[PDB]
Amino acid sequence: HMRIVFDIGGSVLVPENPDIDFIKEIAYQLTKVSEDHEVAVVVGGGKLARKYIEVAEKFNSSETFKDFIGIQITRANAMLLIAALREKAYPVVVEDFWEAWKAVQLKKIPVMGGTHPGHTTDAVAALLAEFLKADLLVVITNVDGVYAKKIKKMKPEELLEIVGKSVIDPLAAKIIARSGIKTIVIGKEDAKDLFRVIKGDHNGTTIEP
Amino acid sequence: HMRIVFDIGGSVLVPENPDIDFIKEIAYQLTKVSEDHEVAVVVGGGKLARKYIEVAEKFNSSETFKDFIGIQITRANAMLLIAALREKAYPVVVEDFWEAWKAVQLKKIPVMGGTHPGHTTDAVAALLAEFLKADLLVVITNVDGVYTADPKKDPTAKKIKKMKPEELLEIVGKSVIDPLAAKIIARSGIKTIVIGKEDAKDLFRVIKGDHNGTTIEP
Amino acid sequence: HMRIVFDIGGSVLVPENPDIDFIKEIAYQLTKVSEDHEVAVVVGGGKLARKYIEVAEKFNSSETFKDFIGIQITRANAMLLIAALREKAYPVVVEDFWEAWKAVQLKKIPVMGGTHPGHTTDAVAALLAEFLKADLLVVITNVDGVYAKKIKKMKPEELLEIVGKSVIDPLAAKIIARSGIKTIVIGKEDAKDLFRVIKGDHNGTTIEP
Amino acid sequence: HMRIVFDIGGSVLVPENPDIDFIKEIAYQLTKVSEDHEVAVVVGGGKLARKYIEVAEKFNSSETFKDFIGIQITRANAMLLIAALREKAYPVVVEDFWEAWKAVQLKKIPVMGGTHPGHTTDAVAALLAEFLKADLLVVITNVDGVYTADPKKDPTAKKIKKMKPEELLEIVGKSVIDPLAAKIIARSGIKTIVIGKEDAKDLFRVIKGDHNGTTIEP
Amino acid sequence: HMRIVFDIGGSVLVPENPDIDFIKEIAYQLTKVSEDHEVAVVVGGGKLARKYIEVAEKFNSSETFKDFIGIQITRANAMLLIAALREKAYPVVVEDFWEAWKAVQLKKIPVMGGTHPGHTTDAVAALLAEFLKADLLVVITNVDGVYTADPKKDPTAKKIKKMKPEELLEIVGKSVIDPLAAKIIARSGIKTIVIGKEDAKDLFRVIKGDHNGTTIEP
Amino acid sequence: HMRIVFDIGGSVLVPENPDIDFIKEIAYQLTKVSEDHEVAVVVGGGKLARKYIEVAEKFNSSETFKDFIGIQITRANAMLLIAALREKAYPVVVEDFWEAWKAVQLKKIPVMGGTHPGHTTDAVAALLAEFLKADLLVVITNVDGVYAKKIKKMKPEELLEIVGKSVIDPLAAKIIARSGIKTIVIGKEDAKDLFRVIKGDHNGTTIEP
């Protein structure tokens, strides 16, 4: 079997408000996938995070404190997934990697939010995939993949170039490259059938050495 | 100089989306008040809390996990106030009473969200006030004060300008303030003031007893 | 099998000093019950807690600090049970619900004391039973049940009335009602044979919708 | 102005049940002393600790779990002192040395219980004193001072008014103070005073060297 | 009075073994500076970090565990500085920004090691400066300042006395300072000074702009 | 099977720099031994710790802070072993006993460093062996055993005498005595084949009642 880390974008889980249908589905699918593989999840902030961050900006708070606000929101979102995962999820929002590790040992799905200023949840999932020696890293974002056109197959090296030229955070790309983490970038559409997405059946981007 | 704990209702702070105008304004008022007094604050969850809690209910989560989600939302809300209080605020959402005590020692304003399942921020505010031996508990909520019945519904609802903890317990059990918060106010005899956001526009007058809200004390 | 939360009153475990015979017995019984069911325990403060609380009262400490003292004592008592439970108990006094949850996963009996000012251990066990989605909540107190006369069967709604009219804390009753937690209230006598108490064989009160 | 660490024996604080009179009195003395000096405190377990530890022994618990139970009892005891120190006390039982340092920065009295299995509160007090670079360690225990033998038993026991760490080590190894605490006092050369509760009635005189106890220093 | 964050490179602090002379000297300089300003410090890992990280690589440990090992070494290093700062230092290695804020409130110098995998102490220093709204970030490293290329290798490397965050980003991406640290400096516009240990001999002059290093600001 | 606590001296793991060959070997052996027994490890500070401690001494830091520095170094060393133990070790350096206990339950080798000022890692391993009710305590130091001559068999009582007359810390000896923990003291040479060292085949000292 495989150890997989799923990075679910905030805008996808919370486009405006929480997308209940999508949460119901992604939760069910994650459960099925965990029947055969070891699963771990990291959730983003989305619209809600940007609203609270914007409020802090009006009070001219530091950029660091804004990140801390964005982080607290992501943990709020993660709780919605943990709820949706029922008895299969780890009860608390995992805040560090070894904790996610403990959940895996207990056969429970750990759900993380952000962890530190300066990063995005993409960076968290990448570092999580690297810490867990995960076999696969699935990034579900707001776009079909890595684009004028769409690149289907590429390597970490090629990924750092595009990032330097949205989609995926630079720190996340550095981590995916330094470790050579097989990563898959798909949109909300392919995420409607994860079970097959991990089988290579998807219309996204596959980044691997 | 007094020690005052402010209990700011979540629906006043976040009616739908965060009410930036009220946050800015109440932050200015708290700052003014803190010039002469020791100030501590507790904020509720509001509309955002109810949205996230309802989503959890749709997945049949336990009421305990729902409370935990509400607590998590109150802390995000608390961060908005901290941002508004600027350099006068204790930098981090305070999670326990002795930490709030600490912020006060440092001449900073601690801002708390929730703490434990089963309670509301109102209970948190009362326990905080009790712990700090505050001189006053000011509850800023979605109503003018304490009425004989729900003022937003019952036409016969009349405002009770003054009352003792015992009476508040009766009216509550029969809710502006919940039971636990009411029991804490009664067990310690905490002087409590219940006002709406109109009176909240001028906290220095509210503190002096110049308001149209309700005053509860032994 | 069942997931059961046992709420052992402080006065029962510590009437004056620790009742060693009762601790020996309740510990053994809890062990047997855990052979077939998932067990979790919450212990009260009793006489000792009231003595230390009274000392703080003489120094006019706040009501909140008094609760904190009562809480530290309950954790002291819980350690006596953990000791009595030997290799079957979780080594540390559980301080929060998800920790009790972890112990259950490890097949170990978690023993909690109090957790927050304003509550009683009854409230803790009720919230614990609700968090663990426990099947049964057993409250072992100083009285035969819920009394001039003794009510054998009743519902949460009926329980909130009596509490408003000792025995069980209001916050605990609110939690038992909002979730509909099947609860059993017995005295020290029935607690001498737990194995059968959970079978419905007892002369106490059964509160359930 | 000096920095002083007070090591209050658990059997003096809780002979059987908590000794309210001694607690009240020692709290007043500590408060007076804190007016001119920086004060920190460590308290032991006493009779309650022995009761709970003996119960654990009856269930064949390891000695490590027994120590942990003792530590837990010392902290409940520490809360009684904190309650007695009122507004002068750091609100929470201090669990590590740097936190005690912090309380001192805030002009408050930190009160510690135990910290780690294997040690006694005496060792905790010595390490605390060493960490804070205290000028003085005052041990208030169940004996008049340090004797050539147990004064409660041996008739030839004679009190040694003054001695050096080395001597205390000899007398201890052969116990008013345990080995580890003694080794810490010797490694750092901490000026230590050992008195009973009679001399504890007036700490300002004790601090000046006016007591009938034992003074240990290099 | 200013608020200054000092980013002391691990290879300057521990070239091979800890450089006691530099530690002693930089501690004296920081102490002098702290007389008039609020000072906070972050230190790197150096040679010891690379040794322990290389050992981990030989056992095929993940890059995340390697970072964690580096962080652990930076904190041991931070303890050497704290020891050097004596009574002016916050007693414990600070692990998060709000704790550093706290040390500053207590008129003490917080010293941080690393915090999270993926970052370097340079990033930590920038985030710290951003969080404290520091007036200045002083990077003391193994080079004279910022050059057009590696001065220890490329012969055409020329020092750029002044530049804007954007330029630093270009030069870095093409490293005195790493990308993340550079992005943080650019997002907030933190006035940053990059000097070697020669200029570090006199921080009061460095602070005034009297140095031969590089100054980065919007 | 047995529950064994291994106390690896700092000078042995770090004579000057980290002895990579020895780490590779001790790690492999610990892994094999854990195939049949429950294993737990405590690592010392060695040369590196003495260097950092000496630096603090030059700045006249307190003896307590020096211990804290020595402690942080030991945790640095423990991370090298955890790395060398790969997927068989507990991911984080265990800082307290019940945490080591949790690792055991998860079938993972917990690696501790120091824990509190005033102690040595020998004291930590002894208290750990006592907390875990370990069957055996193996102390790997810089000397062949307990010496002019070498005592092969002895009792805790006899061990406290020699310590009062290096090798093993007094607090560690008190703990080994008060609990009667069967202890084996060997040098770096015997530690080259742990699997047999625990079988009684070694040229060291066996301290037991």
3-state secondary structure chain A: CCEEEEEECHHHHCCCCCCHHHHHHHHHHHHHHHHHCEEEEEECCHHHHHHHHHHHHHCCCCHHHHHHHHHHHHHHHHHHHHHHCHHHECCCCECCHHHHHHHHHCCCECEECCCCCCCCHHHHHHHHHHHCCCCEEEEECCCCCECCCCECEECHHHHHHHHHCCCCCHHHHHHHHHHCCCEEEECCCHHHHHHHHCCCCCCCEEECC
B136-140 vs B111-112, strand pairing mode: unpaired
* CATH number, domain with residue B36: 3.40.1160.10
D91 touches C: beta carbon within 8 Å? yes
| Chain F residues inside the 8 Å CB shell of C108 | 105
The verdict on whether residue D70 carries a ligand-binding annotation is no
Q: Is D91 on the interface with B (CB under 8 A)?
A: yes
**D98 vs E: CB within 8 A:** yes
Resolution, angstroms, 1 dp: 2.4
Closest chain D residue to the Cα of C61, Cα to Cα: D83
Q: B87 Cβ partners below 8 Å, 6+ apart?
A: none
> Does residue D106 sit at the B interface (CB-CB below 8 Å)?
yes
Is residue B106 within 8 angstroms of chain E, CB to CB?
Answer: yes
- CA distances A86 to B69, C135, D145, D158, F150, Å, are 15, 17, 63, 71, 62
Q: How far is CA B216 from the centre of its chain?
A: 15
Question: How distant is the alpha carbon of residue F208 from its chain centre?
Answer: 17
CA angle D215/D217/D218 to nearest 5° reads 155
Is E28 known to sit in a ligand binding site?
no
* Touch of B by A (3+ CB pairs closer than 8 Å): yes
- Report how many Cβ contacts below 8 Å link chain D to chain E: 7
E101/B91 CB distance under 8 A = yes
Q: In chain C, how many H helices and how many E strands?
A: 9, 7
Instruction: Inform me whether the C-beta atom of residue F178 falls under 8 Å from chain E C-beta atoms.
Output: no
What's the distance, Cα to Cα, between the start and end of chain F in Å? Answer: 21
Kindly provide the b/e burial profile for residues F95-106, where b requires at least 16 CB atoms within 10 angstroms of the residue's own CB: eebbbbbbbbbe
Alpha helices by DSSP H, chain E:
10-13, 20-36, 46-57, 63-85, 97-105, 121-131, 165-173, 179-188, 197-200, 203-207
Residue F67 to residues D121, F73, F74, F119, Cα–Cα distance (Å): 18, 10, 10, 8
Going through D119-213 in order, the beta strands assigned E by DSSP cover: 136-140, 162-163, 192-195
- Tell me if chain C has a CB within 8 Å of the CB of D25: no
Residue type, A92: V
Query: Residues 6 or more apart from B21 whose CB is under 8 A from it?
Result: none
Residues in D closer than 8 angstroms to C72, CB to CB, are 72, 75-76, 79
Residues in C touching F98 (Cβ below 8 Å): 91-92
Q: Cβ C92–F105 below 8 Å, yes or no?
A: no
Q: List the single residue in E with minimal CA-CA distance to B103.
A: E102
Nearest 10 degrees: Cα torsion C40, C46, C50, C51: -120
Q: Is the dihedral of CA A149, A152, A157, A159 positive or negative?
A: positive
Secondary structure letter of residue E140 according to DSSP = E
Query: Does E68 contact B at CB distance below 8 Å?
Result: no
CA dihedral (C50, C53, C54, C55) in degrees, to 10, reads 130
Interchain pair D106, B101: CB under 8 A: no
Q: Is A135 annotated as a binding residue?
A: no
C interface mutation test: which of A90, A104, A111 has the most C CBs within 10 A?
A90
Nearest-angstrom CA–CA distance, B197 and B144: 8
| B162 touching chain C per CB within 8 A | no
**Which residues in chain B touch residue A84, judged by CB atoms under 8 angstroms apart?**
59
Q: For residue D63, give the nearest of F118, F130, F164 by CB distance.
A: F130
Angle at F124 between CA F122 and CA F125, to 5 degrees: 65
Q: Do B184 and C118 touch (CB under 8 A)?
A: yes
Q: Which two tokens stand for residue B31?
A: 């700052």
From B167's Cα to the closest Cα of chain A, the distance in A is 38
Per the CB < 8 Å rule, is A86 touching B58?
no
Q: Is F118 on the interface with A (CB under 8 A)?
A: no
d(CA D26, CA E143): 59
CB contact under 8 A, F91 and A105: no
Q: Closest chain C residue to D27 measured between Cα atoms?
A: C59
Annotated binding residues of C, written as ranges, equal 7, 10-11, 45-46, 50, 67, 115-122, 141-142, 147, 166
* Distance from C-alpha of C123 to C-alpha of C179, rounded to nearest angstrom: 13
In chain C, residues with a C-beta closer than 8 Å to the C-beta of A91 are 97-98, 101
- What is the longest distance spanned by two Cα atoms in chain B? 50
* In contact, C38 and C104? CB cutoff 8 Å: yes
Crossing angle (nearest 10°) for helices E165-173 and E179-188: 170
| Closest residue by Cα to residue D66 from C8, F38, F127 | F127
Other residues' Cβ atoms within 10 Å of the Cβ of residue B41: 28
- How far apart (Å, rounded) are the C-alpha atoms in residues C111 and C76? 11
Technique behind the model: X-ray
Contact A98 F106 (CB under 8 A): no
* Burial (CB count within 10 angstroms: exposed 0-12, middle 13-18, buried 19+), residue F47: middle
Three-state DSSP at D155 gives coil
Domain range for C22 = 1-209
Q: CA of E134 to nearest chain B CA: how many angstroms apart?
A: 13
* Residue A31 at interface with chain B, using a CB cutoff of 8 Å: no
Number of structural domains (chain E) is 1
* CB distance D141 to D9 below 8 Å: yes
Interchain CB distance below 8 Å, B98 and D91: yes
For residue A149, give every residue at least 6 positions away whose Cβ sits within 8 Å of its Cβ, in sequence order, or none.
none
Among candidates E170, E158, E162, E172, which has minimal Cα distance to E192?
E162
Alpha-carbon gap, residue D138 to D39, rounded angstroms: 11
Which positions of F make up the binding site for UMP? Answer: 45, 67, 115-121
- Which residues of C does the annotation place in the binding site for ATP? 10-11, 46, 50, 141-142, 147, 166
Contact (CB<8Å) C65/D73? no
Chain F positions in Cβ-Cβ contact with residue C105 (cut-off 8 Å): none
D46 is in an annotated binding site: yes
- Touching partners of A (3+ C-beta pairs < 8 Å): B, C, E, F
Closest residue of chain D to E94, computed from CA coordinates: D98
Contact B18 A55 (CB under 8 A): yes
CB atoms within 10 A of CB B179: 18
D154 assigned to a ligand binding site:
no
DSSP one-letter code for D11: H
- Kind plus residue range of the DSSP H or E element containing E136: strand E136-140
Is the minimum CB–CB distance between D59 and chain E shorter than 8 Å? no
